[PDB]
Design a binder for this molecule. Structure first.
Ligand SMILES: *[C@@H]1O[C@H](CO)[C@@H](O[C@@H]2O[C@H](CO)[C@@H](O)[C@H](O)[C@H]2NC(C)=O)[C@H](O)[C@H]1NC(C)=O
Ligand SMILES: *[C@@H]1O[C@H](CO)[C@@H](O[C@@H]2O[C@H](CO)[C@@H](O)[C@H](O)[C@H]2NC(C)=O)[C@H](O)[C@H]1NC(C)=O
Ligand SMILES: *[C@@H]1O[C@H](CO)[C@@H](O)[C@H](O)[C@H]1NC(C)=O
Ligand SMILES: *[C@@H]1O[C@H](CO)[C@@H](O)[C@H](O)[C@H]1NC(C)=O
Ligand SMILES: [Cl-]
Ligand code: NA
Length: 755
């Protein structure tokens, strides 16, 4: 096939990792420049693998690395492969977006999967610790297993962590062989996700075999699979806009049986299970001692599917199909008339969860969604390269004025293109309310300087997105925001603009990465942990003030956005060793929004990871947090002073008279103050340490409190999982749901909180 003309294939390549010492390292690789023929006849395995591995990248024996990113581009074509495509650390596998190429497994293909994102060596050790396998894309492919015997074949071994995505992939598999068919689209053994969007699975035994701590996956279609989704294990998982068609089983979540369920919780929203034998197989019964197997259905059609939910241990139909299920919950519920203050285990349909119209797509009535833009129809001439227009991206030069001048002059038909590099910002950059910005494989935008962002008593925005009250169209994608040295006055992104329409203002694959990597000066040398002393709280190890602030009137659509304060060092010489980085606050949302967050995560801030203050119209699915591992050395009262301008939590006051005082002063996973119409569909809010000691896990008591609802906040929580917090949820100062009353297979889990 002809080249597609997609801008990405032809845009001038001027990028380079600023902190890789090799001036000739090449981030972009077109597989055909490595000898791939793309005709489906010549075996292209070696050429594709060489395009990935070229340049001394992070493969076997390399724990992790941020200075060897790669964007591996596959022009339109068919690529015959006979062994796995090994995706090295920090790789974007980018098929052509206009005409997604086919990865065609040879009949004699051998190996784990057509694409392997985390190989096992001969001794059974992964190349990368699964929970550290960050910063990846696979997008725009057809993966064809149909030449392989039905007894073998997996499309992608997707064993990954945060800031990863699968997008726009079709998996074509055989339908013959009965019980001996073993083909599957995704094979996922474990990990810590992550996002998937816009996938189609045709045939096979399983569309996907899934096992992971937590994941958000939406707009998935399954056609003629035996079981569409085999959920092997999880803590939580949120599915939205899933279409299952003519399968034997939709979601199998009964692994382990009624006395050993390995699936923690599943949420299924805005979905359709059509012409399928059994919609969902579960082993849950409300008399069981634990919360394993929790399930939420919200707005799910069951057309032509006579058994919507089946208890496959007893064989009993729990919910009849051939009707829409407005809402179903099984697991423990609190609040309202059903659960009350003590909580109650239930397995029942119930009344619809009504969401405000501002959060919905008016065309479908589903919660609004929009995938990461790839600008397929935009000509290369419309892209304005920052390096072509005066920004150096060298990680030292002050690029503030050059970037500001680009932002001030770019027209709405153009797109600002951040060539890969590291762009030092030394004072506030004002982003206008009409702009589109996209990056070459996660360029770094770093708050730097020696004064402007240094004062936590007088914090300042790094990127100020619109001015207060403005409406417009602002899109950013494929970028990382961070600090160069400590910048405890930096508000990394202040989001003032509101979209003209849903999805017109947002962030896709845009991450805030505070410390831990080359260029930050916040690495193992400077910030190594020392739990054996009282922490000095080194000034050289502070991070930012606040990673994201949606101010009153701001409205944003966030999808695949990781707000991460480093718990460990990311370059290979450090061997994943742990560090202390002191970052005040994660994500703060105020005002009437709306705000959507799909597949967001906020981890290791001191005061809170997510906070809603005087907020309305917030939809998050699913969310994930961690407390910083150094707490309580120091505890959450240090080193950021309480600032009422950000409604900061005041732990010295709030923990007064705590019955569990030793571990009370710890970062909030989620805090809501005077906020309503907030909807959280799935949450994994974890506390794994106390001053790097994990003894507290044995009694699920690393911290005292995890979610705080204050000022009669109406926060509608579904599939809330928390790890090792005595109290999962506290309302107006009273502990409501205790971990001990809601034990799952690892976390504790509340299916449904009625506010
Ligand atoms: C769900 O994802 C699928 C897969 O990307 C989308 O289907 C593609 O839609 C585009 C735009 O119409 C077409 O050009 C492609 O041919 C489609 N691909 C396939 C495999 O069908 C689909 O649009 C998405 N649906 C929603 C509601 O977002
Ligand atoms: C929920 O998960 C827990 C943890 O896996 C299950 O408890 C385990 O059950 C297995 C039997 O399959 C035992 O071998 C383990 O010793 C148990 N561990 C603990 C910590 O109790 C529990 O049975 C599951 N509950 C339900 C209702 O499925
Ligand atoms: C803290 O003490 C332990 C002994 O339990 C030791 O192994 C570790 O190296 C010490 N840490 C530092 C930073 O010295
Ligand atoms: C609490 O939220 C309401 C909106 O329901 C708002 O009118 C009120 O001003 C808020 N209270 C404070 C103290 O800001
Ligand atoms: Cl993404
Ligand atoms: Na302008």
């Amino acid at each position: 096939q002809a080249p597609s003309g997609w801008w990405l294939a032809n845009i001038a390549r001027q990028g380079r990792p600023a902190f890789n010492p090799d001036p000739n390292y090449k981030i972009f690789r077109n597989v055909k420049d490595y000898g791939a023929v793309g005709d489906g006849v010549t075996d292209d395995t070696a050429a594709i693998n060489a395009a990935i591995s070229d340049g001394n990248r992070c493969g076997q024996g390399c724990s992790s690395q941020t200075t060897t990113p790669a964007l591996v581009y596959f022009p339109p074509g068919t690529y015959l492969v006979s062994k796995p495509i090994i995706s090295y650390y920090y790789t974007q596998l980018v098929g052509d977006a206009i005409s997604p190429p086919t990865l065609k497994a040879a009949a004699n293909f051998e190996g784990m999967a057509v694409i392997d994102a985390d190989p096992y060596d001969e001794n059974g050790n992964n190349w990368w610790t699964n929970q550290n396998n960050f910063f990846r894309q696979v997008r725009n492919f057809v993966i064809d297993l149909t030449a392989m015997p039905f007894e073998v074949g997996s499309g992608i071994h997707w064993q990954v962590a945060q800031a990863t995505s699968l997008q726009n992939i079709v998996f074509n598999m055989r339908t013959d062989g009965g019980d001996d068919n073993r083909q599957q689209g995704i094979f996922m053994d474990n990990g810590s996700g992550g996002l998937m969007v816009d996938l189609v699975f045709n045939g096979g035994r399983y569309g996907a075999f899934f096992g992971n701590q937590q994941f958000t996956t939406r707009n998935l279609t399954f056609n003629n699979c035996k079981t569409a989704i085999f959920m092997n294990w999880n803590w939580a998982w949120t599915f939205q806009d899933v279409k299952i068609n003519n399968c034997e089983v939709g979601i199998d979540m009964s692994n382990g049986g009624p006395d050993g369920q390995t699936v923690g919780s599943v949420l299924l929203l805005d979905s359709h299970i059509t012409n399928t034998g059994i919609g969902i197989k579960t082993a849950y019964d409300p008399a069981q001692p634990h919360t394993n197997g929790t399930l939420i259905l919200d707005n799910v059609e069951m057309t032509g599917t006579p058994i919507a939910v089946q208890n496959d241990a007893t064989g009993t139909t729990i919910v009849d199909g051939n009707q829409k299920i407005a809402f179903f919950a099984q697991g423990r519920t609190y609040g309202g008339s059903i659960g009350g203050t003590s909580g109650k285990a239930v397995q029942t349909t119930e009344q619809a969860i009504v969401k405000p119209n501002v959060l919905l797509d008016p065309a479908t009535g589903k919660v609004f969604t929009r995938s990461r833009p790839q600008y397929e129809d935009v000509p290369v001439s419309s892209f304005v390269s920052v390096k072509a227009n005066g920004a150096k991206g060298d990680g030292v030069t002050d690029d503030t004025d050059a970037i500001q001048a680009i932002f001030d002059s770019v027209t709405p038909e153009q797109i600002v293109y951040f060539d890969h590099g590291a762009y030092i910002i030394t004072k506030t950059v004002r982003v206008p309310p009409n702009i589109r910005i996209t990056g070459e494989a996660l360029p770094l935008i770093l708050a730097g300087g020696d004064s402007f962002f240094k004062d936590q008593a007088n914090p300042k925005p790094v990127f100020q997105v619109g001015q207060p009250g403005e409406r417009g169209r602002v899109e950013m994608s494929d970028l990382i925001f961070g600090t160069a040295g400590p910048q405890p006055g930096a508000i990394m992104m202040e989001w003032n603009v509101a979209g003209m329409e849903p999805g017109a203002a947002g962030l896709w694959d845009v991450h805030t990465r505070i410390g831990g990597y080359a260029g930050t000066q916040l690495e193992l040398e400077q910030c190594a942990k020392n739990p054996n002393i009282t922490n000095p709280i080194k000034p050289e190890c502070f991070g930012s003030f606040l990673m994201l602030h949606v101010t009153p009137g701001g409205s944003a659509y966030l999808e695949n956005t990781w707000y991460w304060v480093a718990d460990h060092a990311l370059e290979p010489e450090a061997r994943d060793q742990q560090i202390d980085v002191f970052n005040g606050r994660g994500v703060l949302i105020e005002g009437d929004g709306p705000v959507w967050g799909w597949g967001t995560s906020s981890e290791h801030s001191v005061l809170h990871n997510y906070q809603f203050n005087n907020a309305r119209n917030v939809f998050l699915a699913l969310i994930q947090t961690e407390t910083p591992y150094f707490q309580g050395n120091p505890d959450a009262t240090q080193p950021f002073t309480v600032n009422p301008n950000f409604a900061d939590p005041d732990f010295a006051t709030s923990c007064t008279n705590s019955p569990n005082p030793e571990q009370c002063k710890r970062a909030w996973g989620v805090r809501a103050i005077n906020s309503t119409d907030v909807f959280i569909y799935g949450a994994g809010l974890y506390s794994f340490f106390d001053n790097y000691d994990q003894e507290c896990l044995k009694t699920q008591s690393c911290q005292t409190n995890m979610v705080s609802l204050e000022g009669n906040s109406q926060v509608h929580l579904f599939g809330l999982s928390t790890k090792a917090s005595v109290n999962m949820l506290t309302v107006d100062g009273n502990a409501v749901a205790l971990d001990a009353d809601n034990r799952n297979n690892f976390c504790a889990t509340v299916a449904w909180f009625q506010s």
